[PDB]
């Protein structure tokens, strides 16, 4: 009703792509209760921004892009001059905004304030007016300035060690000299917006175990079925992905008149239903001289309990979803719960048992008493201690036998000393037994915390119990840093689709961190916006996007500029394909420049933040440099202007590829894993440099790709003038002098990294157009279309690569340098094998995502074969010899 709220409601509608008035039309009480109760998370987060204003606001808008640990590995410190770093400090003279500079040599331990204090002393010595300059200048002007990265909007606002900042860290590794800009604190605090957050206007019995009966569900009839034999419905009570009893069907009925009126009894007692028990049903069909074929037409899942802990009862009806791409079974238990909003779909009318009172799930006051009764009714070896620890180290997808499950459950009280055994102990619990679930609830209530990378396992599809997931969120709320949250943010968004209720504990943790870290909330916005087209998650993500847009502050205007800029690029590339897809690229460009010279498009594509990196400002669109690339789905090479006051000190033009036609979710996941593999290698001595370039899906098969400069394809180098010695001669010509061995070193190290990574992940077959080299010798791959299954080695090192590795010898297979190469491939392989538990989890958290290569755990099991998890560490290294020998036809 407020005048300002009507404006904000329209601004949220543009950002999320749908009017917020549709949220008011929802009659579901779970939706309206979510819109209300989620608001206290906004108040707490806004109160955090205003706690130490204006510093707390600056930390929100410009959070420090810092590393995870201040400790530097050995090879990183050796690149420092006696433990010191040379930094270029720039300054802007006020009249004509032209820049002068100081170059300082300081220790890497220095905080940003100490770097400024060194720069203050450098100036005070030049001016011969001394007196006691330390009495005032060193302390009066110390806190009046802050350091800023030249070329982008990154500030050093917090007293971290300078080398811990990500920009300074890479400059040490890449040898470049950091260029920083001093600006006044008063100038930055004058740009900060006003926080005007107000509450929206819409902010103003029998126990389950006291019922002796079997679980039965009635199937009345089905409406709106499409004709092209006989059909039937197939149901099953699931606890996540594991069934609690045998799936039951209804007797076959011809599709002409689909009506059953048939009760379905299940092999489960009502008091034994767990908290997260779900009903998974689907409508299947059968199809003289040929074998009958069963095919699911539609599917739908139902929560046995609602968000008020009340057992569902009475007559009910739900509209079923279309079958996803190539289902393996007749049911879809991993699918989302709820009815299809599109009422023009097969509607199935059901009926549940109605008991005289409202049946609710017992509170933990009753569950605790039942556990003490079961543990008292039952009424310290050391050899078993060794076996228990041996089970903890098993990979998540390792086969746990029935004997080991019964062995884990007997020592469940001794498992608290080894807290990382919890995921194996939970999978050894009969969740269809209230006697075990009660005792397990008591163990989870007091279970010790574990590492964040371990707690994420308890958030995938295998652990649907709220008490299990509530423990995992508490471990993230205490141990998960903002750095690792940005890293694993793609996974943590997908596991929101596993929570059976909109108002859960994982969403309150992500929403609060998004409203506290603007860099977190930026990608948290795009990860949710990219799936609003998916009508299975449009309601969940839409309500969450609305609460974020209603509390993110002034950043909503910046997000709207990004949304409108992408909509223009989407509409243009759509009509480009819809009308000029067969026309020649020459006439495609003359159509492109006419649409881009339009006034409405010109200002819409200028003056906004880069979705790949919100610290990158995009200025004027250089039409002269924009072009349609020579790929299949007409990618757009877009060139922008960097409008920073010192753009030339970093890069003067920003190049981004806009793709419209290909799915970029697989490329995001592969690039995320490559970045972690490089982080694992660097954190223990291995200096293997990868290139996890930027990528971000912003919608249905549309996204952005970061452009890497000074890079050419090996086909583009071989055509410069199919000779194997053409590659080595170009690196020698591009790197002549004492920089030759450095370019050779950077090549073989980057070659070994992508050789081990592509084999373990099993990416698409590399060819002469998927392998690129930079000017300094750095090698990397592009176009990670597929992974996993389709023992194949994709990056087969040809003789062209083997020559430059050994610095161009007569026999590239027998060289002292080639022995150093495979020695790095052996260390990198065993390095990923130690952290193999983390990588298996990242794929299992992405199963809920609709990704073609990730459908079942059988796809994830491919990494168990390439890592040889069922073998010893000596056998696994000998398994990697299949790459150095069978694939290369000689080696090892």
């Amino acid at each position: 009703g407020n005048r300002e709220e009507k404006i904000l409601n329209r601004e949220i509608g543009f950002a999320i792509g749908m009017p917020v008035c549709e949220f008011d039309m929802v009659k579901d009480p779970e939706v309206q209760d979510f819109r209300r109760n989620i608001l206290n998370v906004c108040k707490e987060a806004v109160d955090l921004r205003d706690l130490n204003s204006p510093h707390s606001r600056a930390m929100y808008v410009y959070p420090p892009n810092v590393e995870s640990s201040p400790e530097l590995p050995k090879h990183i410190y050796n690149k420092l001059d006696k433990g010191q770093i040379i930094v270029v400090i720039w300054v802007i003279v006020s009249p004509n905004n032209d820049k002068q500079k100081y170059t300082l040599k300081i220790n890497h331990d220095c905080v940003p304030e100490q770097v400024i204090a060194e720069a203050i002393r450098k100036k005070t010595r030049s001016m011969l007016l001394s007196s006691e300059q330390l009495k005032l200048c060193v302390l009066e002007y110390q806190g009046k300035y802050i350091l800023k990265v030249c070329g982008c909007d990154e500030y050093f606002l917090e007293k971290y060690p300078l080398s811990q900042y990500k920009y300074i860290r890479s400059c040490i590794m890449l040898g470049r000299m950091p260029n920083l800009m001093l600006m006044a604190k008063e100038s930055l605090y004058s740009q900060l917006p006003m926080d005007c957050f107000t509450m929206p206007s819409y902010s103003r019995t029998k126990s389950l175990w006291v019922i002796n009966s079997a679980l039965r569900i009635k199937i009345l009839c089905a409406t709106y079925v499409n004709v092209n034999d006989k059909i039937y419905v197939r149901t099953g009570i699931y606890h996540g992905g594991e069934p609690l009893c045998d799936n039951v069907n209804t007797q076959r009925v011809p599709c002409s008149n689909p009506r059953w009126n048939e009760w379905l009894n299940y092999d489960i007692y009502i008091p034994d239903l767990p908290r997260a028990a779900r009903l998974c049903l689907s409508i299947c069909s059968v199809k003289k001289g040929a074998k009958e074929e069963h095919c699911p037409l539609a599917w739908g899942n139902i929560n046995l309990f609602d968000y008020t802990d009340t057992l569902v009862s009475g007559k009910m009806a739900l509209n079923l979803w279309p079958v996803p791409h190539g289902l393996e079974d007749l049911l879809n238990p991993i699918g989302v719960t709820g009815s299809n909003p599109n009422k023009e779909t097969p509607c199935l009318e059901l009926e549940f048992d109605w008991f005289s009172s409202v049946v609710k799930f017992p509170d933990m006051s009753v569950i605790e008493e039942h556990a003490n009764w079961s543990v008292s009714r039952e009424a310290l070896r050391e050899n078993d201690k060794e076996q228990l620890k041996a089970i903890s180290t098993r990979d998540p997808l390792s086969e746990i036998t029935e004997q080991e499950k019964d062995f884990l459950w007997s020592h469940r009280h001794y498992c608290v000393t080894i807290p990382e055994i919890l995921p194996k102990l939970l999978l050894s619990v009969k969740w269809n037994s209230r006697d075990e679930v009660a005792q397990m609830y008591c163990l989870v209530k007091d279970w010790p915390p574990i590492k964040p990378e371990q707690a994420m396992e308890l958030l995938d599809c295998n652990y649907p119990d709220p008490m299990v997931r509530g423990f995992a969120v508490r471990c993230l709320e205490k141990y998960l840093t903002d750095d690792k949250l940005s890293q694993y943010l793609i996974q943590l968004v997908q596991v929101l689709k596993y929570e059976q209720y909109l108002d859960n504990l994982l969403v309150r943790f992500l929403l609060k961190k998004a409203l506290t870290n603007q860099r977190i909330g930026h990608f948290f916005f795009w990860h949710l916006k990219s799936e609003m087209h998916n009508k299975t998650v449009s309601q969940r993500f839409g309500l969450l996007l609305e609460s974020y847009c209603r509390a993110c502050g002034m950043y909503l205007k910046h997000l709207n500029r990004q949304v409108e800029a992408m909509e223009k690029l989407i509409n243009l590339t759509d009509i480009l394909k819809q009308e000029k897809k067969d026309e020649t690229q020459k006439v495609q460009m003359k159509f492109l420049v006419e649409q881009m010279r339009r006034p409405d498009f010109m200002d819409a594509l200028q003056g906004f933040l880069s979705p790949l990196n919100p610290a990158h400002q995009l200025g004027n669109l250089r039409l002269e440099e924009c072009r349609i690339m020579s790929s299949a789905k007409r990618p757009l090479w877009l060139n922008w202007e960097n409008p920073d006051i010192m753009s030339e000190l970093l890069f003067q033009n920003n190049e981004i590829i806009f793709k419209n036609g290909d799915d970029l979710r697989q490329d995001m996941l592969t690039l995320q894993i490559i970045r972690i593999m490089e982080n694992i290698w660097q954190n223990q001595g291995l200096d293997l440099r990868m290139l996890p370039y930027g990528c971000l899906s912003i919608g249905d098969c549309v996204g952005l790709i970061e452009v890497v400069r000074n890079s050419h394809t090996i086909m583009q180098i071989q055509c410069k003038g199919f000779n194997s010695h053409t590659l080595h001669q170009w690196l020698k010509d591009k790197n002549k002098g004492e920089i030759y061995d450095a370019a050779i070193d950077l090549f073989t190290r980057s070659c070994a990294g992508y050789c081990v990574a592509t084999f373990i992940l099993g990416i698409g077959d590399r060819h002469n157009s998927n392998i690129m080299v930079k000017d300094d010798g750095q090698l990397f791959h592009i176009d990670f279309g597929h992974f996993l299954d389709h023992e194949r080695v994709p990056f087969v090192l040809t003789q062209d690569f083997l020559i430059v590795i050994s610095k161009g010898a007569q026999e590239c297979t027998k060289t002292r340098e080639f022995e150093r190469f495979q020695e790095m491939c052996y260390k990198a392989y065993l390095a990923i094998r130690q952290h193999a538990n983390l990588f298996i989890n990242l794929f299992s958290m992405m199963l809920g995502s609709g990704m073609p290569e990730l459908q079942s755990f059988d796809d994830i099991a491919y990494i168990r074969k390439t890592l040889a998890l069922d073998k010893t560490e000596q056998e696994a290294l000998e398994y990697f010899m299949k790459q150095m020998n069978d694939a290369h036809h000689g080696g090892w």
């Binding site: 040379i86 002068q100 500079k101 100081y102 170059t103 010595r125 030049s126 011969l128």
Partner: protein, 167 residues
């Protein structure tokens, strides 16, 4: 407005930073603070032509000799400064000129030879032996003193006029 990219090179301790500080703020400094690479700028009218001076101070120590290839590529003119007391500064000033003539393949590049520390009443380098080196290089030669402002204006102004001749 025209801008001139001047570079000041030389050995360590020859007083190449005090010459620039004496130009902008007319302040003389005695505390030897070794410089890595600082940049200054100040406009002034020369020969009736208002212009901008993009002065870049370099490092006299051989520790940061790797950065020489960069500022010797963007510099329009050069101000070769040697210490009159330090005989070595007059010796390795040859290595600076030949290194400039290597990056910039042109033999004739804008450059003037400056003899700082002339106020010190203990001259070690002959006053006339620098002209034959300046005549062999084909460049002017000025004797300057950062402590008394003597000729520090003319030495910088002569280099600005020297860049005008190389076009």
């Amino acid at each position: 407005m025209t801008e001139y990219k001047l570079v000041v090179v030389g050995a360590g301790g020859v007083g190449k930073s005090a010459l620039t500080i004496q130009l902008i703020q007319n302040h003389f400094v005695d505390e030897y603070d070794p410089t890595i690479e600082d940049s200054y700028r100040k406009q002034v009218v020369i020969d009736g032509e208002t212009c901008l001076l993009d002065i870049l101070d370099t490092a006299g120590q051989e520790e940061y000799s790797a950065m020489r290839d960069q500022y010797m590529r963007t510099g329009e003119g050069f101000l070769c400064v040697f210490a009159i007391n330090n005989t070595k500064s007059f010796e390795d000033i040859h290595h600076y000129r030949e290194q400039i003539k290597r990056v910039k393949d042109s033999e004739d590049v804008p450059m003037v030879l400056v003899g700082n520390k002339c106020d010190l009443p203990s001259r070690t380098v002959d006053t006339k032996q620098a002209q034959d080196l300046a005549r062999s290089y084909g460049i002017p030669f000025i004797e300057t003193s950062a402590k008394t402002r003597q000729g520090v204006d003319d030495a910088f102004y002569t280099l600005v006029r020297e860049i005008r001749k190389h076009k």
